[PDB]
Structure formats: structure tokens, C-alpha cells
Amino acid sequence: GEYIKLKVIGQDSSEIHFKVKMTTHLKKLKESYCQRQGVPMNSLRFLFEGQRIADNHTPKELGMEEEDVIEVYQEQCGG
Amino acid sequence: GGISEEEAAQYDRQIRLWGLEAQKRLRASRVLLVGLKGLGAEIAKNLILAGVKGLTMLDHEQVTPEDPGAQFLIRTGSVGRNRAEASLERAQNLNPMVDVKVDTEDIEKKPESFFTQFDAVCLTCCSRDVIVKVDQICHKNSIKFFTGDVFGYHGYTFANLGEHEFVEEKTKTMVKKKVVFCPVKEALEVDWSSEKAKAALKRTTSDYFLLQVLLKFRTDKGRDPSSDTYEEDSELLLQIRNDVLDSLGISPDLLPEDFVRYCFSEMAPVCAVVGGILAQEIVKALSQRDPPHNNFFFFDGMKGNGIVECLGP
Amino acid sequence: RGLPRELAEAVAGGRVLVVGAGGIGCELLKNLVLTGFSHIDLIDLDTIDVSNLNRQFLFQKKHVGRSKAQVAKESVLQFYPKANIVAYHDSIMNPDYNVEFFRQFILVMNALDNRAARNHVNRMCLAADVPLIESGTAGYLGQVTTIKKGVTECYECHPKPTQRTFPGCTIRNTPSEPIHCIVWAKYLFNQLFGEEDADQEVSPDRADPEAAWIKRISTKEWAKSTGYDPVKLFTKLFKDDIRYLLTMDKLWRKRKPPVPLDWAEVQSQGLGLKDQQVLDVKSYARLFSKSIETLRVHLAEKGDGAELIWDKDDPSAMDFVTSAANLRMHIFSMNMKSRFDIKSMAGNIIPAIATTNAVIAGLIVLEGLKILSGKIDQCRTIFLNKQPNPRKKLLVPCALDPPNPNCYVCASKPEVTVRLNVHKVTVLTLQDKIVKEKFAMVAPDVQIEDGKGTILISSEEGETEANNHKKLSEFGIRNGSRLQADDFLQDYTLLINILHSEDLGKDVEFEVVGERSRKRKLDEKENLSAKRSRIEQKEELDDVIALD
Ligand SMILES: *NS(=O)(=O)NC[C@H]1O[C@@H](n2cnc3c(N)ncnc32)[C@H](O)[C@@H]1O
Ligand SMILES: [Zn+2]
Fold first, then answer.
1. CATH topology of domain C164-349
2. Most buried among A9, C104, C318, C407, by the most CB within 10 A?
3. Which among C2, C80, C355 has CB closest to B227?
């Protein structure tokens, strides 16, 4: 495969950068994220262009360019 | 260290969000809020629960039978009574630690030095003229300026904080930061006849233009679209759209021809949303903690959109 | 009123349920009435408390100790006595809120602060076939979404976070973070003053495998023989226990050993908010002692042999845990924390403010409307951000997802696999830790799926008490056995498939599905040497590098 820099932005306007191989299972990226950020995995939801990203989806499949953006949304459960 | 144990227990859950310093700022802060219909009432409720030093609620208008039969600061049947005055009661109960004052004199009649007892001023229900005279005054005096309004399903806020210093939290504590606002005048009058401009107009919600329309109908008729006069008001709107699109160079469909349906009166849940946001912008402004949104917030209650636009420099 | 013919009659027409009356709660009730919702049901299981007063605007200091639901209704009524509100003060898990009950509503709205009640309400609305709008806040954030049987995913289509769990040996033997010391102090409070619980011992664990190559006296028993004497408890916990740990020396080969404390030495050797000060050891010690004195009293004020329930708001329970955790901390060379921080970690306090709840409750009614006029196809999950996203969005409306076919709740004949040791696990553990606690059932009936239908658990008080203590293998349960769990109240039925396993790690009683340390550790170094032999030859499937 080839590589892309992708950026993950949080609600808490955080902004983590990643270099990923176009063939990667994006779950690997989610796991990468939760580790560099200390959060348990399905404490999150990753969005590319308003649309969900499941574990096995791929940067190729979703048609991902260089510099592209992923948005993480964490579900509050207080209230 | 020097708030009471009483305050510590009630502000507990906010102090854990934004710290004792920020809350000490709030506590030293005095706020002028103008107009007490739906949006104004939300802001009042929000800033009083936050525990500003004091809130002065200014409205010269009285309760009409057109005014909503339900208003949470205002016991039923209080028609004929001054708005600000009817309100004061329920509002002050929200938080005895806050000095909640009223004022009944029309905002236009107010001298420059009257504004200087306030660390922030926020305008609801004002005509464009008012909005400009006041913004300008607040610029002359280094007062934090806000305006906001609800129109049926839409709402917006606006902010002018001048040269604004704030601290943020650093994501692995505290960072000093600066951000620069510009007059309402410059924000409501963009030269779209530019290259920068016509380029950025692609990324600019139609709601900015819906604003202009609505501000006009307000200047020429001195009230906002009422519902039990729908037919009359709809045409006036359709009209005004065009004259204003003309005067900066916009094609009469970049703002839908259909907007007229959903911008009548005030939808209570839109007041809540926009009043939640604006109130929080003000809190942010006074405690100088966290970045404040660069000038406009536009809420579309049909789509569930909330956009933040930088419109003026 | 300002809404179109169909919709405004539908709103004066319908009955709605708002579950919970806190931050989102009061805010919602107000919006629903001002939007003209004439018929409204309101339920909260709780009274008013002072920390509520910064975001639950229907309630004033004069109202502390009264029902959240009732006072809420009183307060709306003053501004709009037209409005119809029925106000229940009670948990929605209470058996009176059956399917029939839920069937009256056209809409149910959550205003809750926990996952258990949400898992229940999710189930009631699948069962009563009623759309529900779910929502949540914390600090500056929160969200709203719609759930519709047959259309969208349900609350539990996707695993959410579980409450953070710590290995017993980490709590009792080798703490290394303040959270371990605070969890230790909660457990101790529970041994001394609450319901003794074996999963919550605070005494050192001699069976820690990190420490291997006549009983000693338990905590409650040692308390009882000394009559809950503050100073003897001190010596026992912060000295004799530590001496013993030091005996377990394979634990301290790389970690700094705990240092035991002596009561008399500590007494001989003796801005921000008050609660934000960190005190000295002496002070914590003295507070530990005073705290026992007071709790021994609270305990004698119980009627009929009952126990204390731990509460962050009870001064002396909070002091007990503050002082005990700080001392455990010190003993293990960690810097002590303030009551304010400890209260936060011990209570799991979520920061909360008014505006955030106001924004969410606002969104709730708007999505309500859309649902109620067949615009369900316009409904979204709306996120509230702190800062605007790259496309300038502060509220980010997002596409509903459809029902996940492998959901263990909303699917047709829902089914799970559970891995456990059928010889270690008891019926009671099945009942409480698995069925009630993990699968969130409220009063389960559980049988073997064997057409005789051997009973294990009944929801009928004192029917399967005798079975509690028996291991599962005593019924023949083993690999591949299949159980059937019913919560008649939630009208929910779940088949559990047992995977037998012996290899789980003595604190880990189950989990849901769905020489040679010198060879198999020096093999990781060249399973990583080979993994990035193919990485650096343009030829490896999965590869992610962190930058910044
Ligand atoms: N976020 S909050 O703290 O302001 N509001 C939470 C609100 O919800 C109530 N609640 C919690 N769990 C239940 C159950 N099981 N039934 C009914 N109400 C429930 C809380 O008491 C709190 O006031
Ligand atoms: Zn589901």
C-alpha cells in the first residue's frame, strides 16, 4: 500500500495526527487513538464526512485522501 | 479561596468544570440584559444560576395578550405589567446570591456612562440601530458586547469582545491566548462585491442573510413577524429579501424562497438552545477562560445545525 | 400553538413521559409545556439536594429534601397552572411501570444520569413500541438521539463504556495510583459499616500469584473484637497489614515497598477552598479516628440491624474515605489528595452546568416534534461540541444508524455467549453479577433450556434461595449448555450460551463473547523484528503511526 496523514479531531477540540497505510483496517486506528489518549475503546464514535466508520472499513474503501479529517464523538451519559 | 461555604456547595458542580478562579470572576461580574421575552428569559435564568454578582434586566415594554400565555419568569395573567418587572420575582428566586435589578427605561434613552457599571451587555429584541449605538458605546468603554434573537425556528447570537485575552486548558495545564473581534457595524455590512468575499460566500450559511431580512422587517414595522398576521407578514418578507440581496449582489435563491414558513414568532425550544449558547459565551467572556466563538452563532432548529461564522474582518 | 394543525392537536392530544427530573429534566419539562405539551408524566426517584441548585432551576434552597418530581410540578404550575402533569416519586424500575403503562405515551424522553435506568427504559419502549429520545450531558458536552423500534438502532445496539474495574490484588496488595487507594477506602468502609462483601476485602491477599514461587483475622471480625476502636483499627490496617505485605517480598522486587505507620509516632511528630487543602498525615490520622467515632454512632441509629450505605454527601462517610485513602496513599509513597479531589473520584462526580442541559433539553423537544409529525426521517443524533469542527459546526447533526442484527436486546431471538468456570460460578453470581448487573435485567427468571426447564433463578422472593450457594455444574451446566433468562417486567428474553473455561484469572468470574519465558518473550522481539521487516518492504495490511 501507500501512506496518508489523517487527522482525528475531538469535541474537546483536540487534534491528533496519524500516518496510516491506505489498506489498514480502521479499527487499528481507533485503537491507536484510544491508546494515545487514555480512553477505553467503545467509549467513542469515529466519523468520516458525517458517516460512521466500522472496525473493518478501509481508507481505500472510504476513498480517503491525504490530509483528510476524522471526527470523534464521545457519548455523555450524565444529565 | 474566598466564596462562602454556602456558595461552594451550590456551585460545586460548575467549580469542578471551570475552577474557583473563573467562578470568582463571574461573582465579581455585573450584567445588563435587554428584553425579556423568550430568549431574554433563558439568558437571565442561565446567568443567575451561574452566579454573576448581579443582573440588571431592562425592558420598557409591557405584557401583551399576544405574548405567550406561558413564561417561566412570569406568573399567569400578568398582562399590562412591565415585562422586566413581572419577571424579577421568579428570576431572583433562582439565586439569592445574585443582585437582580430591573430597569424600565427604553434602551435608546440611556446615556453613555450608564453602560460603565457592567462588564458585559447583552441585547435581545433591539432594532438594528440600537444594536449599533450600543455596540459602539461598548467599544468606547471596553465593555463586552452581545446580541441575539430567536425567529421561529432560527436563532443567532453575535459577540464583540474587542481585544480579548483568555486562558485555555492545554491537552497534555494553562495557556495564555488572544483573539480580536470587530464592530457589529462591520459584521452586518460585508462587502460581498470582493474576490475574498465571493470566494468565502460559498462556505456561508444562508442564515446570515435570513438575519438581514429579519432585521429589516424589524426596522420597518417595529416588530418581528407575528403569526396571527401571517399572510400580511409573509409577503413583506418575500419582498424585503430581494431589495437586500440586490444591494450586495446575491442571487434571490441562495436564500431559499421558502424560509418564510419557519421564522414566525418564537419557538420556546429555540430560546432554550440559543440562550444556552449565548449565556455560555457570556460566562466564557467574563471569566476569561476558554476560546469565545468568533462573532456569529446561527442555529437552525429544523436541521439541528449550529454554525459559527467569522464575518467582518 | 405556533405549530401546524396536525402537530399542535397531536401535542395537546398525546401523553408524554419524561424519565428523570434533574438538569436535562427541569429544562425539558419547561420546554415541553411552553411548546404546548398539555399532557406530561414526570418521574424521579430522588429528593432535592443543594449541589442541584446551579442547574435545576425549578428548585430553590427552601425545597431541599423534597421530591424532585413533585416540586418540579409545583413550580411549573405557578407559571402555567393550565398544564397537566402527573408526578411519580419512584424509580422507573419499580414494577408498576409496566409495558401497559408505557403504552399510553406517544413519546418517552430520557433525562437520566446512569446507564442502568437507560437500559431499562430502552427496553420498555421496545416492548411498548413507543419512540424514545435518549440524551446525555457532561460539562460542556452532550447529545440527543432518537430510537424507534424497527427503524433505528436501540440504546444497546452498541456496547457502551462499563464502570472502571480494578483487579483485587492491585487494591489489596500493590496499589500504584490514588484511585487504587480511594477504591481501597470505599471497600474498607463497606467492610466496616456496609454490607460485608467478600469481593471487597481490604486485607492483604496472600494468594496473589505475583507473590508466589490457620486463617488470619478478617477486617469486620477484627473490628468486632475490638468494638470498632479507632486506634486499633488504625494499627491493624496501616501497620500490621503493612508488616505482612513486607513478608510478600517478591512483590517489592521492583516496586518501592510500603512503609508502615505507627499511631503514636504520627501523633508525636505533629489558597482555594477548605476542602481543596491537602493536610498532613497527623490530620488525616485524626480524621480517620473521628470518622469512626461518628460512623459507629450512625450505625447504632439504624433500625433493625441495618447497615450504612456509602454517600459522598454524608460528611463522615466522606471523611472516612478521605482520611483512609490518604493514609493508604502515603504508606505507598503517593502524594496525598484533597477532600475535594477525593470526593470527585470517590463519588464519580460529573461536572455539570446549566447551559449545557438547557441546550440539550432544547434539542429534545425539537426532535420530539419531528417525530410526532412523521419527519422521523429528519431526526438525527445531534452532538454538542465545545469548539466548532472543521466545517464550522458547533452542533453536529449526524445520521441515525439502523438496528444492529447482533444486538443482544432488540434482535428477534436475542442470544449471547458467556465464558465462565461452571465449577467456580454460583447461581447467585449468575443472578447478580451476570443477569442483573451485566445484562441489566431487573428481576430475572432463569431456567435451563431443556424442556424439563430446570429452574435456576426465580423473581419470586424466596423461591430459589436454596440454589444461591450451589455451583452451576451441580445442575449439569457445562460447555454448550443454554440458559434462558427472562425479565417479564421488561418483556425481554435472552438465551445465554455457556463457554466453559478454566483460564480466567481468579478475580475474573466471566466475560461476554462476540525455560520458556526466556524463549516466548525473546520471540516477541523477533515477531516485532519480522512484523516491520514487511512494513519496510511496502507490503503490510495494517499499519498506523502516531505523529503530532
Ligand atoms: N443529570 S442529573 O443528575 O441532573 N439528572 C439525573 C436525574 O435522573 C434521576 N434518575 C436516575 N435514575 C433514575 C431511575 N432509575 N428512575 C427514576 N429517576 C432516575 C436522578 O434521580 C436525577 O435527578
Ligand atoms: Zn439494539
1. Arc Repressor Mutant, subunit A (1.10.10)
2. C318
3. C2
